[PDB]
Symmetry: none
Subunit: 44 residues, 4 copies
């Protein structure tokens, strides 16, 4: 299976996370989100 999910982050609501996603080299985005999750999980 697969879990699809559309995430939206907002300019004024969360700037830094916004800037982050917007400058990550295209082709690595999912990789990160995935990583950020990988840790966020153990780190729980």
């Amino acid at each position: 299976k697969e879990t699809k999910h559309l995430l939206k982050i907002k300019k004024e609501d969360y700037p830094q996370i916004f800037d982050f996603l917007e400058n990550v080299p295209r082709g690595t985005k999912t990789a990160h989100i995935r990583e950020a999750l990988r840790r966020y999980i153990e780190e729980i």
Copy 2:
């Protein structure tokens, strides 16, 4: 502004992540990921 990005996590390749998103309380997916990144980010630079 808004960044839209749809991600797909495949059951097989990364079970734990899949399993996670798939079983988080209703209406927490965006919150969680949003949290995960927040922490990830500064953890880096």
Copy 3:
């Protein structure tokens, strides 16, 4: 069906609860309370 109930927690009477709800991630209030009760409930009967 649906149960609607609006609660009000006063800063003074129960600071900690107030402070909590007031600083939980966006779109998690219903989830959290929903969680709190879930646990509360069976903890009882």
Copy 4:
């Protein structure tokens, strides 16, 4: 100050929590929610 919040629980989505709120004697509802929170908090 005060924090107001309208919570809605659904029949088919979460039955037990639904039944609970629906049978608690009227005048004690907030008291509980508040209690459930009181613990949910320390218990964190």
